[PDB]
Amino acid sequence: VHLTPKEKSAVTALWGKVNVDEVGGEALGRLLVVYPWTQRFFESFGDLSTPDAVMGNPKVKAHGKKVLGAFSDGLAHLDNLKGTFATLSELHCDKLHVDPENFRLLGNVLVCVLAHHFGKEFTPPVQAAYQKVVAGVANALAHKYH
Amino acid sequence: VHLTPKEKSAVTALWGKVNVDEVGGEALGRLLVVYPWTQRFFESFGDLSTPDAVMGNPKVKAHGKKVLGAFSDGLAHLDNLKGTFATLSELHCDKLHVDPENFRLLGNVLVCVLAHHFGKEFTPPVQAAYQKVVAGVANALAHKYH
Amino acid sequence: VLSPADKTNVKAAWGKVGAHAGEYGAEALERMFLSFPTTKTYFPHFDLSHGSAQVKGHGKKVADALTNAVAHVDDMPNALSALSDLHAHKLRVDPVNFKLLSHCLLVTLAAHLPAEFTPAVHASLDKFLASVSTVLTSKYR
Amino acid sequence: VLSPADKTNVKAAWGKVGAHAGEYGAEALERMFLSFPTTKTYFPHFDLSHGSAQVKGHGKKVADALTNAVAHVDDMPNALSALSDLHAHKLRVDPVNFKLLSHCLLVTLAAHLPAEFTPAVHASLDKFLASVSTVLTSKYR
Ligand code: HEM
Ligand code: HEM
Ligand code: HEM
Ligand code: HEM
Predict the structure, then answer these.
(1) Which residues of D touch C139 (CB under 8 A)?
(2) Which CATH architecture fits C1-141?
């Protein structure tokens, strides 16, 4: 995915200020809260009953760092997102059976988290760019099911 | 997409028994009644107010044969649905701006119409195969946006 | 949201199903299991071959539940509340699967009652099924 | 279908918006137009540059339409009745765009009211917005 250099410059400066220890856990955590059927793919994760229990759960926070890790990986090779995720799509699709919609949702809860985190800094043009990014990770995470 | 040979025998046989003059305008016609926002892409078709207007509308039956001609084409080159529709997708996606969910929907109303027409003949395994077809047509028609 | 025309079109179409409910609910499930294999995973304790007693018995339950939703159509959340506890909190069913069974249910209806499946009645039924799906997938306790 | 918890979480959160209504409704639309350009096609008669008086004016109405909906939340189809004829019948808006504005509306609120945007209130707001989006997109006359 190709983003115009004014945007590209801004999506790296924002990711730089990212707490590479909490945001990932808020994304996946909010996913399991806002869309309850996502909890079904995380049975081996313990207590998920209350939103506080989903947030405070160590496994949510632990998994969330690797998920965020993939986005950083995809943010660096934004020229070929389909390749870097070619293996991720096999694990999630042809094996784990995650419906393609849940990919756009997590990508969008993540967008909501960056907004929660940055406030006014997460301006409309900085969102617009991140959308192209999270849309791209999704369209690349569903590559081996399409 | 590949169909197991019992299914491939049935799908071609069923399409042989199809009225290449009506079913197409019924599929496209039911798309504009069940999901009335699709009516938007058709201002140059006139009266589409009541379901009777939509079905009896000549442009609907006319355009419907062409849409049916698209499936027919892809049913033959079921080895590379992606290439045959590589042209169709440019028109619908990057130009006509049709959201990909509508491609999943048209292919499902078609499945409903085949069912409507064939009754008992459109059996669960015949549906099971026709789903893979119409989904493949969709995944190929949305290739120029995905 | 259902129109006054939607509500009656369903009542008169599901009325024509009548005694054939369990049979239709059964065909819809099998169509769904064959057509969309990922749906089988929600039923791991089930006997999933053609002519299963389980899916023939489940189909009556599914069809009867939908018959209850035709009965109490102006108040489906109140009617289907033990069913939402089930599908939303207990089973955590993905709403995509509801689109699938709803599609196979329309196909079944299209296969069996050709004179009832007018574009208008197809419209109303899709809408009706989309509404029971919302309820059953939503946690409103 | 909204829960007793949803109903009040939306009332308590959209309440902290208050006087900030039109400003947010305007930022929401802007965030949508920029992030998703295909939504501009629904507004040809509109002044779409940053700071536009129409967008900022539409934003007050969009935002008041939602406040109206938070007022009659227990009976949204009857309230937004005038609005459904507009977006369902007249405009023929694809429900996907509603998903987009709903998302941008959450992003705006996430950016502005961080103390209100708890996992709980987010969940409740997504459901609320999904509910008005169904009403506005369905033909129920
Ligand atoms: C937006 C795209 C997503 C990204 C970037 C992502 C990323 C990741 C990464 C990096 C891993 C760890 C790699 C590994 O251990 O093999 C992973 C594992 C996993 N993901 Fe995702 N994922 C995404 C969406 C989802 C969704 C929507 C679900 C389910 C609702 C899901 C369910 C899982 C599960 C079940 C695992 C295996 C570990 C476990 O839970 O036991 N992922 N994902
Ligand atoms: C299963 C996916 C679809 C197939 C097989 C299909 C096929 C076709 C074909 C073969 C043509 C005519 C060729 C040409 O004009 O060059 C066409 C044109 C067009 N299609 Fe589709 N289409 C699909 C989905 C859609 C959807 C979902 C909509 C509406 C949202 C749509 C709206 C149109 C329109 C408006 C035209 C232009 C012709 C006119 O001026 O009326 N198509 N489509
Ligand atoms: C048209 C929508 C649906 C209706 C009205 C419906 C109705 C029902 C009813 C009445 C039961 C029997 C539960 C009982 O009373 O003991 C049930 C159980 C169940 N349903 Fe559904 N259901 C619907 C959709 C779905 C979908 C689409 C799935 C997922 C593929 C699903 C999965 C299940 C499961 C896994 C159970 C529990 C199985 C069991 O009772 O042993 N349902 N459903
Ligand atoms: C959260 C959902 C939405 C709400 C509550 C909302 C509310 C409204 C309201 C209050 C009006 C003003 C009309 C008037 O009084 O003259 C309106 C107009 C309009 N809306 Fe929406 N809207 C929503 C979503 C959308 C979406 C997603 C689109 C399409 C991208 C859209 C397109 C329009 C258009 C084209 C108009 C007419 C503009 C005009 O009045 O000149 N709306 N909407």
Answers:
(1) 3
(2) Orthogonal Bundle (1.10)
